[PDB]
């Protein structure tokens, strides 16, 4: 019923930010309550010096607390998630993702950094006590033919996004 | 509705096996068909030298195929899952865990190696294409009071298994 | 001959920042060229939006490029290094640590996060092509009796720091 | 000056073994005493069921003890080192790699699993208390032209091994 999407890219547009876009579209077409957040919504000073009294933080958190699931996306810098995504994740409370389904997406220069999703990003979401984390979707920069206006992906990438969004929705209303 | 439990300890019984026995007991009470495997069901030479014509592997592959979920348990050695368990996971098909809900369990002599679950076991399960991996339970040895004749846990460890197992049951619907 | 020390804590003082302090002292007492950098030396805006034209960045990089080794320290937030440390590491060039010995140090609330050094931090330094990375030192918050004025550690922590600094210096002048 | 090479492939020869043979050849040329082990030197049942009285394990432990460095090589399976190799690492003493310089090598069917070295193999070596772990070499299968009768690599893979091996030699001084 309620989903947070979180773009983790330090720049806009991003190849990663556009994976999240396509999902947002496919999901809005279900009148599911979606709340998109990106890093451009926070003050750099609050994220760096780790200031928990961030007003932006309180509003995101309140929305997170009410969301049934999280779809989070990040470029792969230095064999992990962006540090910029991490500074925010660092501010969330200890059990922020408890009870929530999570869907991680990621892009990278090379397929050689595919394992950053499983070995860097998923443990962090797990530290935050995600109830369940999906397999997720990684795309090397070659699967994205255009991320500037409409996202164009290769059929393979689009398919893998479809499959994962499908799983994601079903997990979002188990009883 | 079929679940596989898979013990990854090289000795049996073990602390991690007792977790699976407890899980079995809770799942049978809910009319799940549960099938238990351990490393002792395979010929060591088939595992260590990766021999794909292992009869047991064929049986275990079929059983897994038709299974909706997997509970896997391992002791933590050298900051990761056991080699012993990994020898078996290495022999499974590329997409063996596709469509499946996976509950990882582990035991460890020191709480210092709690992260072995997230940083070592989960990635390997995700390489087998697990559809979703539950948060899981790490138990330091001292939370497992008896593992030989009847699983007996401290209240906190018991409560955490119970919670995980309920999430696991719900996920299978 | 030339070492960079890098505090990765978002706050000062930090339990982690003080591990780096004790090292800096022990090493200055050898007239080794040490260049201490912390996150307080960078503009939050540059680190977040990933601005490579950071003047602070150019000066750190130039000093890094000339350093024979790096000693880097971080608290353990969410089962990894701080995102704040990461935003900087994200800006360094692709092969920044090539040819250099690296010594990682870290602190955490609980010993349960000891493995964050090996599974989160070391891969990032390795992505940066560290020639060699030392075993390193992790300390739970209980090993630090006081980090505010002089660092007080338990003998065990001090010993483990000594052992690692020893190894560190020897590796810094192989021929 | 003693080096152990340790092949972690479950079949022999393998692509990762050919790397170690190449390394051996380069190290002997520099008057290093090199001792080679592989998984076939151990009884599978001792590895898979973690039996510490394995004679081979005793010999390998002694040899490692007196060794200054270790070159270890493994294929990448299910996004990590081989279970087969891990069964052996799990049987080594707690501080087995203390004081030692370690050079990790790996091979993989897809470059997609290059990070298995940093995210999986290194942590386990560091749990054995390796004094320093070199950057290492990942080679996708296609860079290993022959591994059966004479190690034969593409120029780039050969150049990267050469560089690593020189760093390794210097570190042993």
């Amino acid at each position: 019923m309620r989903v947070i999407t979180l773009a983790g890219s330090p720049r806009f547009p991003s190849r990663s930010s556009s994976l999240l876009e396509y999902a947002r579209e496919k999901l809005n077409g279900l009148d599911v309550e979606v709340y998109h957040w990106n890093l451009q919504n926070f003050a750099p000073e609050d994220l760096l010096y780790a200031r928990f009294d961030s007003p932006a933080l309180k509003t995101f958190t309140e929305q997170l607390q009410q969301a049934d699931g999280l779809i989070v996306a990040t470029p792969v810098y230095k064999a992990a998630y962006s540090g910029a995504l991490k500074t925010l994740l660092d501010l969330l409370p200890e059990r922020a993702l408890q009870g929530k389904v999570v869907l991680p997406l990621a892009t990278g220069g090379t397929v050689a950094h595919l394992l950053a999703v499983d070995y860097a990003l998923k443990p962090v979401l797990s530290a935050l006590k995600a109830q369940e984390i999906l397999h997720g979707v990684f795309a090397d920069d070659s699967q994205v033919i255009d991320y500037h206006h409409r996202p164009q992906f290769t059929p393979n990438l689009q398919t893998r996004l479809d499959t994962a969004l499908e799983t994601f929705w079903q997990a979002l209303h188990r009883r």
Side-chain angles (χ1 to χ4, degrees), chain A residues 18-44 46-166:
Chain A
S18 80
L19 285 190
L20 203 67
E21 187 170 332
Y22 168 98
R24 279 190 289 159
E25 188 201 19
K26 209 169 185 74
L27 177 51
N28 284 321
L30 179 54
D31 304 83
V32 179
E33 314 272 327
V34 191
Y35 303 134
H36 181 59
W37 283 85
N38 55 23
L39 279 48
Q40 292 91 96
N41 297 140
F42 293 94
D46 295 338
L47 312 176
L48 259 285
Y49 285 58
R51 299 166 177 184
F52 288 106
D53 50 337
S54 156
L57 177 55
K58 179 59 184 299
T59 310
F60 173 68
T61 295
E62 232 153 17
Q63 290 179 0
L64 187 56
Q65 181 178 307
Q66 273 190 59
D68 299 288
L70 163 69
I71 303 187
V72 50
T74 181
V76 174
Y77 300 149
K78 314 297 180 199
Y81 43 80
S82 64
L85 176 61
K86 182 70 176 200
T87 56
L88 170 59
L89 297 180
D90 283 352
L91 298 196
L92 301 188
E94 269 289 279
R95 300 193 71 94
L97 297 181
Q98 180 178 267
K100 300 174 203 305
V101 189
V102 191
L103 174 52
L105 313 171
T107 50
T110 175
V111 77
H113 283 187
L114 168 149
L115 284 169
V117 179
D118 286 333
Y119 279 112
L121 178 56
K122 293 190 192 171
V124 180
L125 304 167
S126 175
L128 288 165
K129 316 299 189 195
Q131 164 173 103
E132 32 194 301
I133 298 175
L134 303 178
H135 178 78
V137 180
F138 168 84
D140 69 77
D141 287 343
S142 92
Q143 305 271 63
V144 52
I145 307 173
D146 187 15
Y147 64 96
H148 246 52
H149 312 270
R150 187 176 79 205
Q152 174 163 17
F153 320 119
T154 52
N156 176 265
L157 176 48
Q158 189 164 3
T159 286
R160 293 166 60 227
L161 292 169
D162 293 339
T163 298
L165 296 168
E166 167 70 12

